[PDB]
Write a protein that binds this ligand. Sequence first.
Ligand SMILES: [Mg+2]
Ligand SMILES: [Mg+2]
Ligand SMILES: [Mg+2]
Ligand SMILES: [Mg+2]
Ligand SMILES: [Mg+2]
Ligand SMILES: [Mg+2]
Ligand SMILES: [Mg+2]
Ligand SMILES: [Mg+2]
Ligand SMILES: [Mg+2]
Ligand SMILES: [Mg+2]
Ligand SMILES: [Mg+2]
Ligand SMILES: [Mg+2]
Ligand SMILES: [Mg+2]
Ligand SMILES: [Mg+2]
Ligand SMILES: [Mg+2]
Ligand SMILES: [Mg+2]
Ligand SMILES: [Mg+2]
Ligand SMILES: [Mg+2]
Ligand SMILES: [Mg+2]
Ligand SMILES: [Mg+2]
Ligand SMILES: [Mg+2]
Ligand SMILES: [Mg+2]
Ligand SMILES: [Mg+2]
Ligand SMILES: [Mg+2]
Ligand SMILES: [Mg+2]
Ligand SMILES: [Mg+2]
Ligand SMILES: [Mg+2]
Ligand SMILES: [Mg+2]
Ligand SMILES: [Mg+2]
Ligand SMILES: [Mg+2]
Lengths: 95, 78, 124, 50, 117
Amino acid sequence: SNRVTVESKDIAAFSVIRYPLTTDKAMKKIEENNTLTFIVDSRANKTEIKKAMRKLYQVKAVKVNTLIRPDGLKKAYIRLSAAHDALDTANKIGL
Amino acid sequence: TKGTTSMGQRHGRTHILCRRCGRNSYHVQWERCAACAYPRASRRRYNWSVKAIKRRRTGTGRCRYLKVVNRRIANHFK
Amino acid sequence: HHMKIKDLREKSKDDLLKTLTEYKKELSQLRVVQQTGGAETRLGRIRPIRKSIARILTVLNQNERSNLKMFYADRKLRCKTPKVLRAKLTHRRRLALKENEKNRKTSRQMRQAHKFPKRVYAVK
Amino acid sequence: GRFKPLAVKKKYAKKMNQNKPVPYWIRLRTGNRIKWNEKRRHWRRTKLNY
Amino acid sequence: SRRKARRAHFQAPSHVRRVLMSAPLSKELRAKYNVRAMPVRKDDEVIVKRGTFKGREGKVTACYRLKWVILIDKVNREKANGSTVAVGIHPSNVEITKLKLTHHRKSILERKDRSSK
RNA sequence: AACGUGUCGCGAUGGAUGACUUGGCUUCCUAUUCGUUGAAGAACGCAGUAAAGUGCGAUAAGUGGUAUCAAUUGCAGAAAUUACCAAUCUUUGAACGCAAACGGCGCAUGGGAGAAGCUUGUCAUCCCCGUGCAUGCCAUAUUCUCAGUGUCGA
RNA sequence: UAGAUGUGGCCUGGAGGUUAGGACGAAGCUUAUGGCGUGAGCCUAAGAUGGACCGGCCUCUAGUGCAGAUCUUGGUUGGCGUAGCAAAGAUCUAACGGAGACGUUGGAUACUGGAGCGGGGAAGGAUUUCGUGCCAACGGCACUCGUACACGAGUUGUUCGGAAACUGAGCACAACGUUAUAUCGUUUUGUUAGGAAAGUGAAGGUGUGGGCCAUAACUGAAAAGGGGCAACAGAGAACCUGGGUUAUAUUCCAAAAAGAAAUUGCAUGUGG
RNA sequence: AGACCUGAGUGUGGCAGGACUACCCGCCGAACUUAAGCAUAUUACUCAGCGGAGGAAAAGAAAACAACCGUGAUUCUCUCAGUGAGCGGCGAGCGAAGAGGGAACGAACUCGUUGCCGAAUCGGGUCUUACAAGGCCUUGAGUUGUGGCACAAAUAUCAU
Ligand SMILES: [Mg+2]
Ligand SMILES: [Mg+2]
Ligand SMILES: [Mg+2]
Ligand SMILES: [Mg+2]
Ligand SMILES: [Mg+2]
Ligand SMILES: [Mg+2]
Ligand SMILES: [Mg+2]
Ligand SMILES: [Mg+2]
Ligand SMILES: [Mg+2]
Ligand SMILES: [Mg+2]
Ligand SMILES: [Mg+2]
Ligand SMILES: [Mg+2]
Ligand SMILES: [Mg+2]
Ligand SMILES: [Mg+2]
Ligand SMILES: [Mg+2]
Ligand SMILES: [Mg+2]
Ligand SMILES: [Mg+2]
Ligand SMILES: [Mg+2]
Ligand SMILES: [Mg+2]
Ligand SMILES: [Mg+2]
Ligand SMILES: [Mg+2]
Ligand SMILES: [Mg+2]
Ligand SMILES: [Mg+2]
Ligand SMILES: [Mg+2]
Ligand SMILES: [Mg+2]
Ligand SMILES: [Mg+2]
Ligand SMILES: [Mg+2]
Ligand SMILES: [Mg+2]
Ligand SMILES: [Mg+2]
Ligand SMILES: [Mg+2]
């Protein structure tokens, strides 16, 4: 190996999903749709935002739409499988 | 003519961003940085512009490993 | 409050990695709070809770660098250790000449150090 | 217009953030020398081209 | 030199800025411990020896140690809107009358006193 | 007269001058000179509130060690700040898997997610993480493989 | 006049000496403040100036005296409220807002006239978008408005564009050559004095009643012409409507997917 | 049907490139200017250009100077010396060296040859407290010579 530095299961899932988003549009999409809005790290992956959700918020994710905002910050919309209410996570996650 | 009118024909880009020099002197067509000669291993450096050498020497940037290694070699270690 | 390192060294890797994943989650939701409300009491725990993840990844790296050093710094055969653990010292201090030479001499150069040594004479 | 590399996108985003004013908790600091931002770009005045 | 001293002064780190802010002990607290002067600590009762607030005793509220001043609890000043604020007397204009204990202060106080004795 | 002068007092603009000077310059001196173990450079980042800068690198305005004592300070917050001397050290760059206005693409190699099938778990592509993989040169391989109508011999 | 020379001669910055001032007000600065020196200049006074340094003398020292260089820099000024703000669409009204020519809505008359003051893109710009404020200076008039300022937001893709994955004009890493030297030259109408590569097929290894059957290892089957870029208009490319954003939509919609397709990968299984 | 020779291939173990360049070393290298013109010359064996190291570099232990009553590695300094040297359209200009006083300096050494040896060498192991100035196994390099020793028709070499 060319390293010693320790790794875990945590840092692989807490670096991707960094904090949720609260806006007029990020709120209008939790209630109306079942999406959430997390400002994911920029070099993440739509398949790894799903894994991260399920590893952090034990909910399923169907469609994870992303976009690198004009701030270098990668937003992420996340449908919650229609079986996990989104309005029951923003109230859990404390959004 | 050759003034305000011809200034309208200014569509292209001769230079884009140099991945090594970080400035806007990467000549597109023949792909070489006009200011650091990238992809040439050696950065361009000419004594006929010492003033531009000074803008590009060490210490003009962050100088990470040296501000550390110059501390270790000045304290009997290496 | 947070993790105190003087009592954190004694912990183990598997005990640290559960200690770690809990400071991550605690900071994970402190950056939820930091979005919506200000709540300096609910907030303000970030800079201690974010430097406690620092002094856990520290001791994690402080340890598994030693375990991988009390395993490679060995008299084992063909003792080639990864260059990240090999005593780091400048590129030229690494090439120049170790102590075992730069003091090494031939025959017919040892033997004058004996026949004709340098003396500690004094003049009167 | 619509094509910008991501790297060229990362560099205008680093400029949209640098174009905010000095917050009014800075000028009550003990001995600062800052009253204005004096590096604020305006998109019309001066261009970045990167 | 002139130039290097006014730089090592104003460019002095925080732990240096505390021995450059030491105040003389009172006439009857020095021979109590047989030393000359101490760096001012938060909650050490003092008395101003110079200035508009001279001869005004108080307890050091803080050592605002980049303004180069200490804040006395009874030395206040009024703003325009009634709100009362604290003026900073340079420690050398102050004379300590009280100390705050420590197993690191009545140990260094006799490190300074072992110089005398 | 009004205007235009013109001298005086007072104002405005202006920012000289003086006073100051944590800067410059010059001179001298005491020691030790970066990088494939990834430098210099630049790129993007990181603060409870930070745009620049300074500091730092996803341990991010710092973690560790010692050694010091009670602050930091715009104001929150909090039973640390300062100084020094083992780590962490992102994307690049000599940049070296290939490329490159692609935050792109592989080849090995582990391990770790996630799952459909399937046997409560097990590795399918998919997707992360990490190492290795550039050329040249030197050394070398218990008899590691080879080429030659070069030499010779069984 | 050019020039020369003298001056116990004038002046500025600083040094070595000396004498001496200064918060009971130093430098500086102002002048119908006088006086006194032929003069350079000095000294005084008086400042409803200034706030902390400094004068005389003897030597020393120099970045030492300015009106004039189309001097240099900064600032001001005249002309001067002057030239002008004259090409390109004529605003008119109500009542409403507003601190108030301004805006909004209605009505009116128009202008652009489908090679547009239209709707979309590339190049380029990169927040100018949006909303809510705001109105200091910027929009050469003005503004309650703004592409301005502030805050907040805003860009959603199996299928669209790009890449992964084509070749063109061409480029040139390697090698090789040359060069004191390379950052030089050759280089797809196929490289190189030139040994430039796992795509396949296999015996053997492996669960187990020595073979039924199966993955795998590590070999190694012929096979010439090293790689590699270069096209957001060439080639290529699996998605279409309907609709519920302050600003995105062939991107979003969740289960009477608003629907309907196509399609790639791997899988289980009905058809032989 | 094998050795050797000459070449390959990847496996290991490494290294090189890059930065810095004030000084330093090599190559390259002008012109403006001066000569009241200018082409020799001067500028200048300079600037720029290519390359390369160091804490200094370079030089350095006489195929040296001298012509003396001789000196004795290199470097540096004062000096010789702007030279009664000298080069030069003998013009403009240029221009050293020995010696001397110094600094420094316990400053000298080792290959090849020669003779005597001839694998005593080197490298991979291993064993020992890491001992590799050693032990003891090693064809693995090496006999196309690693290593050891001696310094002159004058010394003493050479072994217990
Ligand atoms: Mg091109
Ligand atoms: Mg290259
Ligand atoms: Mg170079
Ligand atoms: Mg001034
Ligand atoms: Mg160096
Ligand atoms: Mg790095
Ligand atoms: Mg920075
Ligand atoms: Mg390369
Ligand atoms: Mg080797
Ligand atoms: Mg063989
Ligand atoms: Mg043969
Ligand atoms: Mg002067
Ligand atoms: Mg002058
Ligand atoms: Mg003047
Ligand atoms: Mg004039
Ligand atoms: Mg704006
Ligand atoms: Mg080339
Ligand atoms: Mg040969
Ligand atoms: Mg061979
Ligand atoms: Mg290798
Ligand atoms: Mg190279
Ligand atoms: Mg080099
Ligand atoms: Mg001439
Ligand atoms: Mg010459
Ligand atoms: Mg040069
Ligand atoms: Mg040398
Ligand atoms: Mg002379
Ligand atoms: Mg000459
Ligand atoms: Mg001599
Ligand atoms: Mg020999």
